[PDB]
Amino acid sequence: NSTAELEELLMQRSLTDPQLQAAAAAAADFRILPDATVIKIGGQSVIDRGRAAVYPLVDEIVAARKNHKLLIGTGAGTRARHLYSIAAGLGLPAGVLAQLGSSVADQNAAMLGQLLAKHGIPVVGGAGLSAVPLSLAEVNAVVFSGMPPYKLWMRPAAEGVIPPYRTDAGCFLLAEQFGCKQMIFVKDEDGLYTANPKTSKDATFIPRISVDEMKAKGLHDSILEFPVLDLLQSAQHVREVQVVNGLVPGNLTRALAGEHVGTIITAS
Amino acid sequence: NSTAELEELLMQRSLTDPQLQAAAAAAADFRILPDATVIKIGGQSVIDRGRAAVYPLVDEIVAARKNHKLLIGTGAGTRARHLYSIAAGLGLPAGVLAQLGSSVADQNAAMLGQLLAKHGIPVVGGAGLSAVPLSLAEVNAVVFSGMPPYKLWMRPAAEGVIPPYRTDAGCFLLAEQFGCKQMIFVKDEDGLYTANPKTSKDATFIPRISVDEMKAKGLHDSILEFPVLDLLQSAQHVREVQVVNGLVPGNLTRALAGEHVGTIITAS
Amino acid sequence: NSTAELEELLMQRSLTDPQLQAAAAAAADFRILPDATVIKIGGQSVIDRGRAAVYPLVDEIVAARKNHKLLIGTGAGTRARHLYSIAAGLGLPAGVLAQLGSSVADQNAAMLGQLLAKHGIPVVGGAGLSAVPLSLAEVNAVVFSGMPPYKLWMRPAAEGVIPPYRTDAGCFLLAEQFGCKQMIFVKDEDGLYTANPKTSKDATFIPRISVDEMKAKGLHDSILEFPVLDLLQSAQHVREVQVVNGLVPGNLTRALAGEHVGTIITAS
Amino acid sequence: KRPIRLLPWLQVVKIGGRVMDRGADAILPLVEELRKLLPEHRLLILTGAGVRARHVFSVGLDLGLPVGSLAPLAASEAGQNGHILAAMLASEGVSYVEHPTVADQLAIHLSATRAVVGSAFPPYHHHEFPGSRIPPHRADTGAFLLADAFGAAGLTIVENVDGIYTADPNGPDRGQARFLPETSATDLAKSEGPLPVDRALLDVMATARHIERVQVVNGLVPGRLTAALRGEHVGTLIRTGVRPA
Amino acid sequence: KRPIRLLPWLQVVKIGGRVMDRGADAILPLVEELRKLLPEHRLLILTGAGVRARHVFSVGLDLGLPVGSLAPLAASEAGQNGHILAAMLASEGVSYVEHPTVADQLAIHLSATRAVVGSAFPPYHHHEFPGSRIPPHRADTGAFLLADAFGAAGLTIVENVDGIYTADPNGPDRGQARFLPETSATDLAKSEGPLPVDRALLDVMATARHIERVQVVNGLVPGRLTAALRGEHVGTLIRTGVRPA
Amino acid sequence: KRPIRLLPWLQVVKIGGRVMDRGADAILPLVEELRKLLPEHRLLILTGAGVRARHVFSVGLDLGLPVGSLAPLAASEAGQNGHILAAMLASEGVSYVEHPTVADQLAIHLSATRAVVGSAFPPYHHHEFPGSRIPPHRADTGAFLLADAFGAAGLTIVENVDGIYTADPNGPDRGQARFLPETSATDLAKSEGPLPVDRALLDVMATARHIERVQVVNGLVPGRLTAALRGEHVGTLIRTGVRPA
C-alpha cells in the first residue's frame, strides 16, 4: 500500500472496486474531537417528563462540564410519535416522517438550551466542529438536536414507514464521525434487561453484553434503536456504548467518572 | 393547582378558556438571562449623530463590560423615517413599513459592531441566548438589531401605517423575555420632561414616574414608543425602565452602577 | 474640509463628482482588526499536497496563535482548475466560473478546519468580524474560505473567462478591509524569482521588490494573481505583502516573528 | 386613504390544527375538497397547531419557560401540519412555503402554482407580548394579520365545529350552548368565555383596514369550505367593523 | 469565441435610487408603465440606492469606516427600494428576489412570472476595491455586470434626467451643460467631471462580451422606458465597444 | 398499503459525474437531447460527482479524515456539475435547486418550469454510515432514494458505458466482460466485483416501495436517454424486486 497506489486506484476504478475499497481502508485515521463525550438525553424518557427529570440533569451537566467536554443531543418523544401516527395513517413514506420528527428534537434542544444559556452552554448546529465552545473552561459543552440529516433521503425499514434512524442513531453517528471517546444514552431505566422492564415483572438486569449476544436473545429492538446496534458493529471509533438511567440523581456524573453504572453494550 | 390539573385543561379546553389561562399563570417562572442588562442605543438620538456621540459610548461599553453583562440593541433613525415617508405615500400598509425599518436598525448594528470587533464584542442574531459571548470575561456583551421580528405580521396602530412596535419595543421585549435585570434606553435628552424639551423652553424634569401617571399627564407618546408603556404594564420580569442621555459622558456607566441618572419609569 | 462640507456634497452631488470624492478621502481611517495577520494557505501549492504539507502547517498554526492573532484563508487548487477547464470549454462566462471555484476553496477550508477543531480554531464565515474567537487566548485564530464574494458579478479579465480575482485577491482584500497588520501568502516556493523556478534552472531569488519594479521586469502574473498587485497599489492599510514557502518547516512561524524569509512585495 | 391592497385576488384559508389532529378521516376529504378548489381560487392555505402545541406548553410551562419561549415551540407544530397537508397536495403542484417566502414572494409563488401552504402562526417568537403565560398571537391571529395586510378577498377559518356558540359545545356547559350564525368582533371581545378563535384575533380585527368579515365553518362537513369561499353562509360570520371606502 | 448567452431573451432595467426617492409622484407612473410592459418583455428590474445611501456614507465616514464597510450599507438601501417597487407590482405577480436567486435561479423565476425585482448593487461587500472611500461598484455597475454575464438583450438605465450632459445639469455649471444623445464608454472614461452613471460602469463596459449599447433615459417622462425597450432613441446611448461576432 | 406516490408524474434522470467530466464533447449533445425532452416529460435531473470527488478523497484520506468528512466533500462536486448543467439549460427556463427545495418544494418548482437540476448526492454528510472509508451513499443511491420516496414514474441512470457488464469494461479483465441486458438487484448484490452503480443502490432497492425497474443507459450515444424515458430497452434494466399492488 501507498498513497500512489491509492491515488492511482482512485483515478482508474469505480469506487465499488474491491481493490480501491481495500486501499482506502489502509488510510490513516484522524479523530476530530477525541476528548469529547456524546450524551443523548431521551425525549420520551426524560424531556417529556418535565422539570422533575430535566432540572437535575441540567445541574449535572453544569457540574460535569468542569471536568468533561460534552456534546449533548436531544431525543424527540411523544410529539414525534403523534406526527408519525398522523402521517403514517395518511400513507406518507418514511422520508416524509423523518422530516417531521426533526422538528420535535429541535423543540427539545431549544427548551434544554434555554435552561443552560445562563451557564454559557449554547444550542448549536454542527456540534462535532463546535471548536470554540468546546475549548473554553467557561463552556466545554454544547446542545444539539439528535435527529440525523437524512430527511426525505431516509432509508426506510424493511416494514412500515416509521423512520428507522432516529435520535439514538443521530447521536451515535456524530460520536462515531468525530472520533469521540464515549457515547452515553440517558434514558429512564437502569439499563438493559432480559425483557422490557415496564412490562415484565421478573426481567433480569444485564450489566454488559455484545451486539451478537443481544441478537441471539432477541434484544435487537429493546432499549436502543435496532439499527444503532448494526452501526455500532461497523464503527471505526466508538466500539461500545453505555445506557444509563437519567432519573437517578448523579447517574450521568458517575458514568462520566468511569463508574460502571447501567449497561455497556459492545460491538464485539 | 397541579401539573395534572394544568395538563388536563391544556388537553381538554381551548387556549381561550379562562380556567386554562388561570392554571397556566400559576406556572413556575424561569429567568433565562437574569444577570444581563439590555441597553438600547438610539438611532436618531445617537448613532445618526456620528463619531461625537458614538465613540464615547463605544468606550463606555468596552469599560462597562468588565463589570456588567450587556445586550446592546440598536435603533433605526432618520433613514427609517425616510423609508416610512416614501412607503406611506404609496399607500403601503404597516406590515410592509415594518420590514423596511429593520434594514436600518441592521445597518446601525453593523456600524457599531465594527467599532467593537477588536474588543471581542460580536453582532449577533439571538442575543438573549448568546450563551457563549455572555459567559466570557473577554466578551460579556453582544450587539443586536433592535427591531422586532413581526414584519408583515406587525399589528398596525389605530391610525396610520407607521409600525407602532419599533426599536424601543424590540429591545424591551427581549429584556422581558429573557428575564434580564435592567433595561436602559440611551437617548439624547436627560430623561422625561413635562413636555418635549426640544420644543418647550420651560419643561420640567421628571426623575421618576409610573405609566398611569404618564398617561394622566399625556406623556404616552413622548420619549418612548407609547406601546412600550403598555407592554411594560403587562411585563412579568422587567417592571421598570430607565431613560438616560447617552450624549453625557459616563452616563451609561453611571446608570449601570446604580446611579439614578435620567428618568425611571415604573409599571405601577 | 468639514463634516458639513462632506455631508452637503454627499446630498447635493453625484458620487462621481471629484469634489465629493476628494472630501470623502479626508475622512478618518478606522482599522477594524489592526492586530491580526491574514495568511493564505495555497490550494495547489499546499493543501492539494496532503498530509506532508498540511500537518506541519497545522502544528505551526496551533503554536503561532499563542502569540499571534490569525485569519487563515484557503486557496482552491487543482479541482478548481478542472472546473474552470470544463466550464470554459462549454463557453460559460467568468461569473459562472467564479461560483464554481468558491466550492473548492470551501472544501479546503472544511478539511483544514477539521484538523484544527480540537485546538479550538473554527471555520467561519465573516472572518474579519469574528470578534469572539479572535479575543480568546484559547482560540486567537479562525479559518475562512479564500474566494471573493463576487461570483456572477465577477469582472472578467481582458481576455478569456478565468475569473481574475481568486483566492489571493480574496485574502488580500480581507486584510485590507479589516486594516490588518500583515498579509502572508503561503506557497510552495521560497519566494519570487526572476522567472518561474519550476521551469527555469537559473532563476535568481528576489528578496524585496515593488509592484512597479515587478511590472517593469514582467513579473506581473508570476507567484501572485496579477490583479492583486494592482489592488496592493490602491490599498489604504496593507501596503506590502510577504510570500513564503509553507513546505519549509517553521517558515510561517518565522515570518510571524518578523524574520525576512521569502519575498516582500511593496506597493511603492 | 386606507393602504392599498397588495393581493386583492387572494383567498386565505386557515385550517385548524385540531382538524389535522383527526388524521386521515378528516384530512382525506379536506384534501379532495381543496383539490377541486384549486382551479377556482388563488389560495394561501395556512395551518394551525392543534394538540401537539398543548403538549409542548405542558412541558415548557413545567420547565418554567416564559411566553416568548413557548411561542415558537407551538408555531413549529403548525409548520408540521403544513408540511403534512402540502405533501398530500404535492401531486397537484402545491408545496409548503416558509414565512419569509410568504411575506416577500407570495405573488411569484401564486403565479407559479395555484395554491401554497404555510404556517398560520405569526413570527412573534421571543418578542411575543407578555401578560398571559400562553402565547396570544396564534394561528387565527397570524392568518388574519396576513389576509388583512395583503388586502385579500377573504379569510375563511376551517374548524372542527359548526362555528361559534355561546359556550363550548364540547364542554361542561355544552347543554346551554347556542349557535351564533352571525356576530361582530366587538361583541365577542366583551364576552369572557372560551371561543374557537384566538382572543387576539378580535383585537387585530379592530385595527383592520380591509377584511370586513371572516367566516368560521366546519371542515368536517364536505362542501362547507367550498360554499364559504363563494360567500355562502354556512357557519358563523364574524363582522370585523371595517366598512367599504 | 465569446462566452455563450445564458438568458438571451432577458431585458434588464435599472431604476435609479433617486427616482424612487421622489416617492409616489414618480413611482406611481413608473409602476403603471411597468405593468403595461409585463406582457411585452421578460424583465429583471433592479433598483439603485439613492439618498439614504448618502446618509449612511455620511455616518460611516464620520465613524472612519473603510470602503468595504460602506459597500453593503449602501446596498441595503437599493434592496429596500426593490422591496418597495416589488410591493407595488405584487398584484401583477411580481416579487423581489434575493441575490443568490438572481444569480442561480433567474431562469425558473422568469418562467414562473413575467418580471422580478432585485437589488442592482453587486455583492462586493467587504471585498470592495480600495482606493476611493466611496464604494466604486454601485447600482449601474452591478446591473451591467449581470446583464452582460447573462448575455441579455439589453440594459436600460432609468434616471431622473434626460441622459448624460457635458456637466451636471443640476449643478453649479449647469448653464454650460449640453445634452449628449450618443457617446462611447471610452470617451466618457477619459472625461473627469461628474456623470449620472458610476465610473466603474465604463470599466466593466471595456471588458464586456455581449452588451453593445446601454441607453440612459428619463423615468420621469412616461413612455420613455417603453420606447427604449423597443430600441428607440429617447435618451443617451452609451456604446460599450463590444461588436457582433 | 404501501405509501402513496407524492409525484407520480415525475421522471428522475441521474447524470453520471464521469459523463460531465468529458466536457463539451459529451455535454453539448446531452444538453440538446434534454432540451428536446422538456416538452415531453416533467424532469428532475440530478448530477453525480465524477473525478473531482476522487481527488478530494485522495487528499482527505491522506489527511486521515473519516467517512463522514468525505461525504459532503464529494457531494460538493455533484452540486458543481449540477450548476454547470443548469447554466447550459438556463435559456430553456431550467435552474439548479438546492436540496431543501428538492425535498419540500419540488411540486411548485415543476409547476413553474419544465425541469430542474439538483445534486444526486443525498445529505448523509457527517452522519454517513461507517465501515468503508469511502462514502457509501453516493449519487445513484441519492437519486433512487428520491425517486422512490416521490413514487416517481421512473429513474434512469445515464452513464459513460452501455450498461452493466460482468466485469469492468474499461479494466484489467475487460476481455471477459459480457454485457447484461437485464438483471435484478438481488443478483447484483451477491456478486463481488465492481459495478457502474453504487452498491448501496442495491440495498435501497431492496426496501423500495414503488420503483420496479431502473435502466442504466449510455449518455454518450444520442437518443438513448429519450428511448429509455419511453420505456424502450436500450441499456441494462435493473429489476428492484418491487411488484404492483
Ligand SMILES: Nc1ncnc2c1ncn2[C@@H]1O[C@H](COP(=O)(O)OP(=O)(O)OP(=O)(O)O)[C@@H](O)[C@H]1O
Ligand atoms: N429489554 C429492555 N431493557 C430496557 N428497556 C427497554 C427494553 N425493551 C424496551 N425498553 C424500553 O425502551 C424505552 C426507551 O425508549 P424511548 O423511546 O423511551 O427512549 P428515548 O431515548 O426516550 O427515545 P426518544 O428520545 O426519541 O423519545 C425504555 O423506556 C424501556 O421501556
Ligand SMILES: Nc1ncnc2c1ncn2[C@@H]1O[C@H](COP(=O)(O)OP(=O)(O)OP(=O)(O)O)[C@@H](O)[C@H]1O
Ligand atoms: N416629554 C418628553 N421628554 C423627553 N423627550 C421627549 C419628550 N417628548 C418627546 N421627546 C423626544 O423624543 C426623542 C426620542 O425619540 P427618538 O426617535 O429620537 O429616539 P430614538 O431611540 O433615537 O429612536 P430610533 O432609535 O428608532 O431613532 C427625544 O429626542 C425627544 O426630543
Ligand SMILES: Nc1ncnc2c1ncn2[C@@H]1O[C@H](COP(=O)(O)OP(=O)(O)OP(=O)(O)O)[C@@H](O)[C@H]1O
Ligand atoms: N517568478 C516566479 N517566482 C516564484 N514562483 C512562480 C513564479 N512564476 C510562477 N510561479 C509559480 O506560481 C505558483 C503559485 O501559484 P499557485 O496557483 O500554485 O498558488 P496557490 O496559492 O497554490 O493557488 P490556489 O491556492 O488557488 O491553488 C508557484 O508554484 C510557482 O511555480
Ligand SMILES: Nc1ncnc2c1ncn2[C@@H]1O[C@H](COP(=O)(O)OP(=O)(O)OP(=O)(O)O)[C@@H](O)[C@H]1O
Ligand atoms: N364558544 C365556542 N364556540 C365553539 N367552539 C368552542 C367555543 N369555546 C370553546 N370551543 C372549542 O374550541 C374547539 C376548537 O379548538 P381550537 O380552536 O383550539 O382548535 P384549532 O382552531 O383547530 O387549533 P389551532 O388554533 O392550533 O389551529 C372546539 O372543538 C370547541 O370545543
Ligand SMILES: Nc1ncnc2c1ncn2[C@@H]1O[C@H](COP(=O)(O)OP(=O)(O)OP(=O)(O)O)[C@@H](O)[C@H]1O
Ligand atoms: N454629466 C451629467 N449628466 C447628467 N446628470 C449628471 C451629470 N453629472 C451629475 N449628474 C447628476 O446625476 C444625478 C443622478 O444622480 P445619481 O446618478 O446619483 O442617482 P441614481 O442613479 O438615481 O442613484 P443610484 O446610483 O443609487 O441608483 C442627476 O440628477 C444629475 O444631477
Ligand SMILES: Nc1ncnc2c1ncn2[C@@H]1O[C@H](COP(=O)(O)OP(=O)(O)OP(=O)(O)O)[C@@H](O)[C@H]1O
Ligand atoms: N461491471 C461493470 N459494468 C460496467 N461498468 C463498470 C463495471 N465495473 C466498473 N465499471 C466502470 O464504471 C465506470 C463508470 O464510473 P462511475 O460509475 O464511477 O462514474 P459515474 O456514475 O459517472 O460517477 P458518479 O457516481 O459520481 O455520478 C465505467 O466507465 C466502467 O469503467
Ligand SMILES: [Mg+2]
Ligand atoms: Mg380554533
Ligand SMILES: [Mg+2]
Ligand atoms: Mg445614476
Ligand SMILES: [Mg+2]
Ligand atoms: Mg456510475
Ligand SMILES: [Mo]
Ligand atoms: Mo430545517
Ligand SMILES: [Mo]
Ligand atoms: Mo433548523
Ligand SMILES: [Mo]
Ligand atoms: Mo432557540
Ligand SMILES: [Mo]
Ligand atoms: Mo437557539
Ligand SMILES: [Mo]
Ligand atoms: Mo453556532
Ligand SMILES: [Mo]
Ligand atoms: Mo453560527
Ligand SMILES: [Mo]
Ligand atoms: Mo439550521
